């Protein structure tokens, strides 16, 4: 017996065999999945006259629940069942419509931006539809589908209906970004990019994937704003933060210039607190969403108050708990620690030229520093370098989020002439390293706000390193096109973007790649392959940007790059790197060098290694450069537990080095240093600690500091989270 409520109201006999036929289709090709197991699990939940939608999400979920490391292909069974449902939900059948027809409807409904129909003719669409392979929807893992369905696919947020499917998202992302190209190359570039993305070679940030092809022109995910030492600037910064967190951008705030408490007055913290409410202005119940990382030098007079800003037990005025902090450090300071000496704390306002030099010129810093320490007309405060470091190290440890920026490494090993366009801060997750100028007022045309235009190569989807050439052309070009496509809430933002056209392209799936070349993080066994891999990335990237400058002109301010001066990443990297790898450079950096000097680069920076969370779940890939905590990863959702097994777990379980089995941090840090050699910006590098690996379960300060030192020694620009296992 048993009935079924159809899509609108009609009611038919339960078609048991339609269901079964769908599952058999879904299980096609897979291994170690029982169809009847899924059926027994889901059938027992059916009730007379159950909705048709519910038959679907039941069988979907029944499959999802069987996802395990012993049966990884349940993630594919579930995916395909979910895919099939979403087709019917958007199209009322599995067969998707023709591209043109779909796009037309979509403009009628005002969900796609109608310049798509403006910029392309009917068989320009006709053609693109032949580029499409709707079968690639079958390659997604269940977790990936849940991500697509959650936050990529155009859908009504109220009613909950889904309007597109993943392939259209991809083809249409490509069509918009390349909408400007000459007729000769345009559909040729579109086809090629679509392919790179549909087959997971290139990942793109969530705003870009969910937004481009819709009527929006905001796609920004993170900004950097530098705050001057004035109420005008303080206000301006704050205003710019509001505008940006309102678009859900992640904020990076340099705030170290603000003068100390008692200066000829009430000091930093009240203003930080203000930057915080700003960052929180469009969030949740004022607590959840919109994050920021705020930066200051180590030697700032207020530093001991600043470091404990996230500490639980304090007074209210003592604490600004809902932002992360980046302590800025240079060589001199470390030397004070090792030489067991003092660090002097100065209010910026009281020490002319010191702040500036901190970033741009170490030699001068060392001079101005030693002078001012001596000159005792100048307000100062001395602290024991061990003590000061310990404070910083323990707050970092307890909160997991006091970060470190090596400001010398960010400037001696930068694409920017430190003297013209210093890098004096990072973004929220410490991979972005670009020039910034304070603002007079929200609309000051002379500020610079840096933003992050991001992408990534899936190292696990490339068959070999030379694939990165055409991938690097595709990636750099599409991002460069977006730079012109999107809009800028603040003029200072626009200037950085247009001035220096800065890109941050990185990697996902690194651990998987390492696993399958049979290497590990912890033992040094990867140092060379890493060196080879990142020489390949940086070279192909710079090359792609180079011929784009040939084609379209170097970025307006290309002249403030070391690149313009013929200086390359390979000239200025930290030397000790020689002691840990010895792969030869395999490409002609000298041919490239010369070409750069001649035509310039379209982009001032090309590479940054960001963390990914969403990008990498969608491709079933390990997250950027991170090793996986375990083999199966879990998230909550209001659809049950989403499990995702690591790529090729079947053949690679012993090849992975899961995060916590690394004996310590050195191997990893060496790989990060080696990456840094070629990376224009920085890397979201972590330090991890498992307490159960130390006497009486406590991580000793000695260790915390040795790893900090190791990081610096290998020229590591920033240091992001510190993880501490528990139990």
């Amino acid at each position: 017996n048993l009935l079924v409520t159809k899509r609108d109201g009609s009611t038919e006999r339960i078609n048991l065999d339609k269901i079964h036929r769908v599952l058999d289709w879904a299980a096609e090709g897979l291994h170690n999945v029982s169809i009847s197991q899924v059926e027994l699990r889901s059938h027992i939940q059916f009730y007379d006259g159950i909705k048709t939608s519910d038959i679907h999400e039941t069988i979907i979920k029944a499959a999802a629940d069987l996802i395990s490391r012993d049966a990884p292909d349940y993630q594919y069974l579930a995916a395909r069942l979910a895919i099939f449902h979403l087709r019917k939900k958007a199209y009322g059948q599995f067969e998707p419509p023709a591209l043109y027809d779909h796009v037309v409807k979509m403009v009628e409904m005002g969900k796609y931006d109608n310049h798509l129909l403006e910029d392309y003719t009917e068989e320009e669409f006709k053609q693109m539809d032949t580029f499409i392979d709707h079968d690639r929807d079958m390659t997604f893992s269940y977790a990936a589908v849940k991500q697509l369905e959650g936050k990529y696919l155009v859908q009504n947020r109220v009613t909950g209906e889904i309007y597109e499917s993943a392939q259209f998202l991809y083809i249409l992302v490509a069509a918009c970004l390349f909408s400007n190209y000459p007729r000769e190359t345009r559909l040729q570039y579109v086809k090629r990019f679509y392919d790179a993305v549909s087959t997971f070679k290139i990942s793109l940030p969530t705003p870009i994937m969910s937004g481009v092809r819709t009527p929006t022109r905001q796609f920004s995910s993170c900004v950097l704003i530098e705050c001057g030492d004035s109420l005008d600037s303080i206000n301006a910064t704050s205003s710019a933060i509001v505008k940006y967190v309102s678009q859900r951008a992640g904020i990076g705030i340099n705030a170290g210039r603000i003068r100390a408490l008692g200066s000829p007055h009430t000091g930093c913290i009240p203003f930080y607190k203000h930057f915080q409410t700003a960052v929180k202005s469009c969030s949740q119940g004022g607590v959840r969403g919109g994050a920021a990382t705020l930066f200051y030098p180590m030697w700032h007079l207020e530093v001991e108050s600043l470091l404990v800003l996230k500490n639980n037990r304090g007074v209210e005025g003592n604490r600004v708990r809902h932002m992360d902090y980046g302590v800025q450090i240079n060589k001199l300071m470390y030397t004070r620690l090792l030489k067991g000496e003092d660090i002097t704390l100065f209010s910026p306002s009281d020490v002319p030229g010191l702040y500036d030099a901190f970033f741009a010129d170490q030699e001068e810093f060392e001079r101005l520093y030693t002078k001012y320490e001596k000159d005792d007309s100048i307000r100062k405060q001395r602290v024991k370098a061990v003590e000061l470091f310990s404070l910083m190290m323990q707050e970092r440890a307890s909160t997991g989020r006091i970060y470190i920026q090596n400001v010398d490494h960010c400037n001696t090993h930068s694409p920017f002439d430190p003297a013209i366009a210093p890098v004096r801060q990072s973004n929220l997750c410490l991979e972005i390293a670009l020039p910034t100028k304070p603002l007079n007022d929200v609309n000051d045309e002379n500020g610079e706000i840096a933003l992050c235009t991001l992408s990534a190569f899936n190292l696990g989807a490339i068959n070999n390193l030379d694939e990165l050439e055409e991938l690097a052309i595709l990636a750099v070009r599409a991002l460069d096109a977006l730079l012109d496509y999107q809009d800028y809430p603040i003029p200072a933002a626009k200037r950085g973007a247009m001035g220096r056209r800065t890109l941050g392209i990185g990697v996902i799936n690194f651990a998987y790649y390492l696993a399958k070349h049979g290497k590990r993080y912890s033992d040094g066994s990867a140092n060379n392959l890493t060196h080879k891999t990142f020489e390949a990335i940086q070279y192909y990237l710079l090359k792609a940007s180079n011929e784009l400058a040939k084609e379209q002109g170097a970025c307006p301010w290309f002249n403030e790059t070391t690149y313009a001066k013929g200086i390359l990443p390979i000239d200025t990297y930290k030397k000790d790197l020689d002691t840990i790898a010895n792969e030869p450079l395999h490409y002609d950096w000298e041919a490239l060098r010369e070409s750069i000097k001649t035509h310039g680069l379209r982009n001032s920076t090309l590479s940054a290694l960001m963390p990914s969370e969403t990008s990498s779940q969608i491709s079933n890939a390990t997250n950027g450069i991170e090793p996986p905590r375990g083999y199966v990863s879990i998230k909550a959702s209001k659809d049950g537990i989403l499990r995702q097994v690591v790529p090729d777990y079947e053949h690679l379980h012993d090849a992975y080095e899961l995060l916590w089995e690394m004996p310590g941090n050195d191997g990893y840090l060496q790989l990060v240093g080696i990456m840094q050699k070629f990376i224009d910006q920085s890397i979201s590098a972590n330090t991890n600690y498992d307490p159960s690996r130390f006497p009486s379960g406590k991580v000793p300060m000695q260790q915390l500091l040795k790893d900090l030192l190791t990081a610096y020694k290998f020229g590591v620009k920033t240091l992001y989270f510190q993880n501490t296992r528990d139990g």
Partner: peptide, 12 residues
């Protein structure tokens, strides 16, 4: 707690 004595040995 820290030993500054081996610390110093380190090369930056």
């Amino acid at each position: 707690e820290v030993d500054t004595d081996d610390l110093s040995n380190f090369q930056l």
